[PDB]
């Protein structure tokens, strides 16, 4: 290229050093100690006893060669509360007579159609621990008498069985392990203000005995502790269970996993962020605390919190730190979690219904924010070091402006420009023979550096010509040789890319598999057994 001479037409300087901000090397975090609470989805489970008399009434046609069961009528009948506390508890015996009401009439059944007697409750043969039963007879009385007549006999079997009882929210009923549903709150009482609970029976059905000592029917050992014993007579049994107040045995919030080294991130303005590196989750709550007077039955979320915040306060941080407030901070987190947080200061320093989903959103929020905060810190340092490197390099670009001032214009602009040093500012200006054979060969064209031909001789009279080098020896041309060997001061930075990873669906158990667990399925058993009369009999035919 040919270079015209620069004039004083257009001047320009170099850009000076420039300032640039700093990365945020400090966040407003608060180390603490926290426990987490979820929705209680588990029912209220308690122990109970059932007392009934199993009455079967069998009728037999007695033939000459055989006997045939005509009727077999089984009814279960309640044992009165006076007989629970005066013969079963005192003596371990039960009368062989059942008096009960049925079709609004007082009716009576006698065992073996005989006079009543007290019979000892013996244990069942199949009695295992937790599923213990007691019964008076092992026989079912049947009268098989003379030929040609019907004969009816009556068995009365007094059964005492230890059952488990379950109650689900709002605790207006409970169900026994026999399958029986009791339409009454298990927290009902006629005393100490427990009468506002739901009773679905007559007042004569219910009865409560204060200062009761349970007597075990195998060991005949009265218990050391007393209890208030509720009694309820049903048309089919009497259930007996221990009374406890509702607010002491039931919460709507259940304890989930604890967090030893919880950090309360307040870097994002307007919200809190509870990060546990041991759980692997970050929970985002608001600033205002939860009012635990608004949640129904949420009263153990603060006494079980402080009993376990303090229980590991005396295990990890006692010599190095102290708590603050003596009442933990209770927050409603995103997704339905209750974060009972307690700060940890240094030694040198209309009800609400809470429904809890899954915690998969908090694992992603932990994983994203921990990889966000590192790549913003890392790339805020390479930005701060690139800004500083270009400032100290500007001293080197100014020193090659006093000597060879035309190289700094070619590098800064891009086109092969020519600059002259006009004091402290630069002015920019934007038939080929081989050579004359007789320092630099700048004589005539038909020759400085970087293929720039001068319009004069300026030397004392290799050289690079185009894409070649012309060799001279004692000021005489030889050949246009090439050089393959090249030195390079360029540092290399080979940065690859993240390859794409596809995430196919992957579940350990599917929905059909997780519902096919259990011996019996009630919807499949019923849609086979209610087809029984249509499958093995003829309903649509009518005799005449």
């Amino acid at each position: 290229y040919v270079c015209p001479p620069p004039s004083g037409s257009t001047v320009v300087r170099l850009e000076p050093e420039q300032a640039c901000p700093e990365y945020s090397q400090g966040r407003n975090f608060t180390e603490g100690i926290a426990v987490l609470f979820k929705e209680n989805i588990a029912p209220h489970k308690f122990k109970a006893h059932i007392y009934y008399k199993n009455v079967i009434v069998t009728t037999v046609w007695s033939g000459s060669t055989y006997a045939a069961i005509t009727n077999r009528f089984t009814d279960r009948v309640p044992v009165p509360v006076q007989e629970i506390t005066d013969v079963i508890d005192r003596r371990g015996k039960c009368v062989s007579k059942a008096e009960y009401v049925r079709n609004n009439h007082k009716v009576t059944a006698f065992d073996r159609d005989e006079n009543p007697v007290e019979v000892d409750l013996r244990p069942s043969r199949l009695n295992a621990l937790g599923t213990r039963g007691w019964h008076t007879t092992n026989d079912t009385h049947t009268k098989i008498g003379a030929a040609g007549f019907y004969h009816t006999g009556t068995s009365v079997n007094c059964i005492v069985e230890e059952v488990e009882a379950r109650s689900v929210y709002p605790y207006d009923s409970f169900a026994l392990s026999t399958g029986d549903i009791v339409y009454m709150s298990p927290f009902y009482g006629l005393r100490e203000g427990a009468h506002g609970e739901h009773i679905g029976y007559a007042p004569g059905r219910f009865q409560q005995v204060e200062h009761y000592y349970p007597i075990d029917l195998d060991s005949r050992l009265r218990a050391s502790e007393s209890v208030t014993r509720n009694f309820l007579r049903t048309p089919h049994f009497t259930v007996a269970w221990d009374w406890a107040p509702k607010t002491r045995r039931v919460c709507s919030l259940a304890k989930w996993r604890e967090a030893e080294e919880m950090i309360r991130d307040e870097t994002r303005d307007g919200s809190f962020r509870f990060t546990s590196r041991a759980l692997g989750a970050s929970f985002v709550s608001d600033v205002t605390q939860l009012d635990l007077q608004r949640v129904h039955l949420g009263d153990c979320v603060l006494r079980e919190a402080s009993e376990a915040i303090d229980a590991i306060y005396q295990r990890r941080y006692n010599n190095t730190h102290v708590l603050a407030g003596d009442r933990p901070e209770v927050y409603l987190a995103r997704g339905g979690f209750v974060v009972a947080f307690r700060p940890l200061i240094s030694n040198e320093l209309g009800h609400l219904r809470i429904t809890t989903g899954s915690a998969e959103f908090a694992r992603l929020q932990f994983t994203y924010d921990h990889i966000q905060a590192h790549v913003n810190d890392m790339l805020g340092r390479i930005a701060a070091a690139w800004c500083e490197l270009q400032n100290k390099d500007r001293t080197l670009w100014s020193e090659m402006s006093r000597l060879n001032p035309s190289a700094v214009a070619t590098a800064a602009l891009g086109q092969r420009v020519s600059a002259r040093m006009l004091g402290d500012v630069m002015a920019i200006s934007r038939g080929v023979y081989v050579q004359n054979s007789m320092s630099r060969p700048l004589v005539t064209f038909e020759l400085g550096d970087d293929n720039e031909l001068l319009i004069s001789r300026d030397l004392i009279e290799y050289f690079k010509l185009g894409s070649g080098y012309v060799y001279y020896e004692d000021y005489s041309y030889v050949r246009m040789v090439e050089v393959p060997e090249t030195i390079s001061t360029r540092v290399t930075l080979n940065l690859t890319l993240l390859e794409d990873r596809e995430f196919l669906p992957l579940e350990v158990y599917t929905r059909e598999e997780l519902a096919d667990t259990g011996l019996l399925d009630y919807s499949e058993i019923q849609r086979r057994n209610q087809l029984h009369a249509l499958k093995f009999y003829d309903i649509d035919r009518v005799v005449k």
Partner: antibody
Amino acid sequence: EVQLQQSGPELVKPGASVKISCKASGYTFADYTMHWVKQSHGKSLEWIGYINPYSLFIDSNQKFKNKATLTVDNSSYTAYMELRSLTSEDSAVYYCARFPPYYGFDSHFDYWGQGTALTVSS
Amino acid sequence: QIVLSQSPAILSASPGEKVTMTCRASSSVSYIYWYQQKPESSPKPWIYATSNLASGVPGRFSGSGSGTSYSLTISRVEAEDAATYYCQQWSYNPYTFGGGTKLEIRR
């Protein structure tokens, strides 16, 4: 019929001790609790406490924890109330009442005594 | 203790007038139990379980109420019904009787 025969009027000097009886007839004595009430002259009824004459459990009032003790013999079918450390504010008619050994809807003082006039004077 | 404040202390009714009396409880109790006492006699059970009448009491006595408000009303008052009437609870320790309503038949 159910009858709760109770003791007689007793003039007793201050600082002494009085045992007041209540004899039952007409029911099985050992499966009903026996309660005691107090009625000063011209005023209302105050509950002392009870005794269960099968488990010998006594539950009493906190105003009468140091002024009354309750005992029952199983033979003579009687209940007793021992009033001690007497004051002139302990002059009343003291009744004896029958109550069930459970708490149902029909648990009430179904049969009463006839009263013992107690007088603390000189 | 549960205070059982009986509003009409003395009540003067005329034989034939429907007269009510109310017992006000401090906290909520399960049931209320009414007792009648005359001068120089033991108390007598009169209404149990807030609405059930005892043995040998005329049907003109009827009681109603729930929670902290209870009431005893007489349909047609007679001269044999002049006595004092006590409401009573056992829902808490100690058992507490009310104040008393002296009914005076204004003849």
